[PDB]
Structures are given as C-alpha cells and as structure tokens.
Amino acid sequence: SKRYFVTGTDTEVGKTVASCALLQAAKAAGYRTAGYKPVASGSEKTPEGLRNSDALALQRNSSLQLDYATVNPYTFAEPTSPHIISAQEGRPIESLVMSAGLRALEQQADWVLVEGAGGWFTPLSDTFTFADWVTQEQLPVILVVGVKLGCINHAMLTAQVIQHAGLTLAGWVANDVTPPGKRHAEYMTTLTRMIPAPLLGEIPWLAENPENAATGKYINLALL
Amino acid sequence: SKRYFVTGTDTEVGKTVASCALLQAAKAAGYRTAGYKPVASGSEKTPEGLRNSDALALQRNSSLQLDYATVNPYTFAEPTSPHIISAQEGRPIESLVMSAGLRALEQQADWVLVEGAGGWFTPLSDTFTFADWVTQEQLPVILVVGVKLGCINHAMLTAQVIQHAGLTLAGWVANDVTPPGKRHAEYMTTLTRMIPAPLLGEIPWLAENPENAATGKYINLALL
Numbered sequence A, B: 001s002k003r004y005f006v007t008g009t010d011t012e013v014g015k016t017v018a019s020c021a022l023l024q025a026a027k028a029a030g031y032r033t034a035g036y037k038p039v040a041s042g043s044e045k046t047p048e049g050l051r052n053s054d055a056l057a058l059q060r061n062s063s064l065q066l067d068y069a070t071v072n073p074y075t076f077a078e079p080t081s082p083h084i085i086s087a088q089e090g091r092p093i094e095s096l097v098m099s100a101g102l103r104a105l106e107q108q109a110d111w112v113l114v115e116g117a118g119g120w121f122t123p124l125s126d127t128f129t130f131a132d133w134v135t136q137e138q139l140p141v142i143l144v145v146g147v148k149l150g151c152i153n154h155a156m157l158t159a160q161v162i163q164h165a166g167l168t169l170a171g172w173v174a175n176d177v178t179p180p181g182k183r184h185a186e187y188m189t190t191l192t193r194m195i196p197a198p199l200l201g202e203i204p205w206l207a208e209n210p211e212n213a214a215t216g217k218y219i220n221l222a223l224l
Ligand SMILES: Nc1ncnc2c1ncn2[C@@H]1O[C@H](COP(=O)(O)OP(=O)(O)O)[C@@H](O)[C@H]1O
Pocket: A008, A010, A011, A012, A013, A014, A015, A016, A017, A018, A054, A175, A176, A177, A178, A203, A204, A205, A206, A207, A209, A210, A211
C-alpha cells in the first residue's frame, strides 16, 4: 500500500492544506485513505483530552472514519518544538510508537499520508529528529512549497538534504499562501526547474477555510 | 587578510544587522575593514543611480571610506530574486565581476565581510547560484540565525549544505529579531548543540535602527 511523508519548506507554508488536497485526490482515485500526524504541538483542550487542528483536518479528510488517537498518538498543548515540550512534560517521543501507529493505519487504509511537524529537521528528542524517523521508515517524501520570497532557497535546501539521506523525493506541491504577486510565473518556473521531482499541482489562494475546501482537483495523482 | 561570507537562514533574518555588528567588532579589534554586497535587489533611486540599503549599511560600517560601487557592483531596483530581475533587465551577473570586486576591496582592507542575498541558494542566473560563487572563492561562512520558530530546521539545513560543499562554517550569530519569547533559552541551547560552529554572539532585540546601533560588543571575534 502507498505511503508518503509530507514535509514543507518551513512551518506555516501549507503542509496541512496540501495534505488535505492530496487525501481528497486519493479518495477521488478510489483509495481507502488515512492521514497520520504522529507528532503534534499547539493543541486545544477538549473533554476527551488535547486535540490538534492539523490532526483534526487529516482525520476529517480521510475516507475512513478514524479514531483521533490513531491519527495522532502524540499531542502537546504548547506550539513549540516537539523535543522541548516533550522534555518539559516528561513524555518521551518514541520511534517505535510512531512506527507502530503507521502500521496500525495500514491495517485498514491502502493509501497513507503522514504529515510531519515544522520543517525537515524538527527535533523529537535531543538526539533524534523527524528526519531520522522518515529515514528509518524509508518513506517517499512530498515537499510542500509555500510560494513566497525565500522559498527557492528553502525548497533547494530541503530537496538536497532529502536526497542526501538516500530518500526519494516523490513530488512537490506549490501552495499559494498569499494572493497573486508580480513574479508568480517566474517563481513557478524557477522552482519547477530546480526541484528534482514532479510538480503534482498548485493550490490557489483560498482565504476562507482552505482545509475544508475542495482542493483534490488541484493535484494530479498520476504524476505521483 | 581575513574574509568571511555572511549567509542567513532566510532573507529578513538579520544578515545586515549582524554584518554591521561583525564589522564594528573587527574595527574595534584594529582591522582595516570593508563590507561587500556584490549583488543587491530592492533599491532606491538617487541622483547617482540606484542605491541599496544593505550596501549603504555595510558602507557606513566599514572603517575605510569606500565608494558605493566598490561595496555593491550589482544593484537592482526590484526586490525579487537576482536571476529574475537580471534576466528581465538584460544585465547578467558575472562571477568574474563579483570576484574582481572582492579583490579590489582586499587592496585596502585587511578584514572583508561579504554579505549574500536571501538565503544560501539564491540564484544569480538560471544556471548559477550564490552558493556556486562562495564555493569558488572558498570563503569561510558565518551563519546568521534569526531566533524564531522554524529557525532550528533552517539552521540545520543551511549548515549541512555548507559542509557538504566542502566549505568551512566559521561560526554563527544569534539574532533576536523579535522581543523575548517563552522558549528563548531552550532554542539557544538547541541551536548551540546542533550548529557545528562557534556561537560568536547574540544580538538583542533593538527596535529602532539596529543597523546603526553599537552592536560590535555582542560579538566575540576571538571565537572566529
Ligand atoms: N492555499 C491556501 N490559501 C490560503 N490560505 C492558506 C492556504 N494554504 C495555507 N493556508 C493558511 O496558512 C496557514 C498555514 O497553512 P497549514 O496548511 O496549516 O501550514 P503548515 O501545516 O505547514 O503549518 C493556515 O492558517 C492555513 O489555513
């Protein structure tokens, strides 16, 4: 069954919005989908415990009805780096637990999308990063590029490090985080030439609730 | 004579403010200093032609009185990627010209700081990046890290790519781009452990005109 890890050029560039588009496209293609956000920070209190908004978006965009903990085993209240809040709360983040959760989702889904947290190298402990886990799992990687000044550099940096870890950069998604600007077409051309993976699609600037917008149509899953 | 290239985790993270601090510290140490911004975009019209604000800051923080063109040979009006505006204006950016300017500054300065543009991989043409030129010149690199969420990932990405190009990462500067936040000390500890170079100093949050503030005192040039 298909598995992809979605990373971004930084936090707040559209990993979640693009992940929802990817999931919607996969459902459209007829897959039994599941989104997985193993580690999340910046969460709200509910009667059932802490709930993170990215995990909720992935959960509602999955074709299967998934229990929250299955989508997101590790939930932290404070929106800081996972290693910091994990250490302060005395709740270690374990590779084995993250991997077990991925396997559990594969029990019922045949197309699984895993969203990272922050950018490529987000630390999970003082000696282990998110990049370490993706490398262990050998997940093909999808890069979400927020189309904005500074994204060529971040996209190139992330792509190079991914390739140097021996991993497959399966594709990239262009996310229009801001309204159209002057050098939009030139930026798209530059990113397209420089990123060594297929451009899967471009998600337009959608001001209101992009996470629930019908954005599956912007992704060409046959290029994946 | 000493030469350093200053790069940043992105544009707008403090390359210029930190570069001024570095230059001020070097003047304090007794060096005959010069700042060099070979390529600049986002400039204002004057009677003498276009003038870029980073180049002006480097010029005024140099111990020597330097002509503007010597500090910044390539000046573009629009603040977009150098390769885009160079191509649209029909003004090619040449490695040879950038290198000649560096040599010219070495005629009178014994300590030269070269500020890049954007982040590490800013394109200068469709086939040549700023990273290519730094690699040709074999300049030791100073990384400016804007202390903010997302900087651990960008700092790690930039450091890894620099080391993989065979270059020396001579040090890093922590720049407080925003007022103090909750995980400041933890971020400093994490960056310190992860960046494989000496922390040269930390520039505090200085709301008003940081470029002309006396910030040389925040840099320990003996760690360089
Ligand atoms: N294409 C879009 N159009 C408009 N707003 C966007 C779009 N993509 C992202 N958003 C908004 O920008 C912010 C960051 O997007 P998100 O997908 O949560 O980023 P990340 O998951 O990388 O943290 C959110 O408020 C989101 O609603």
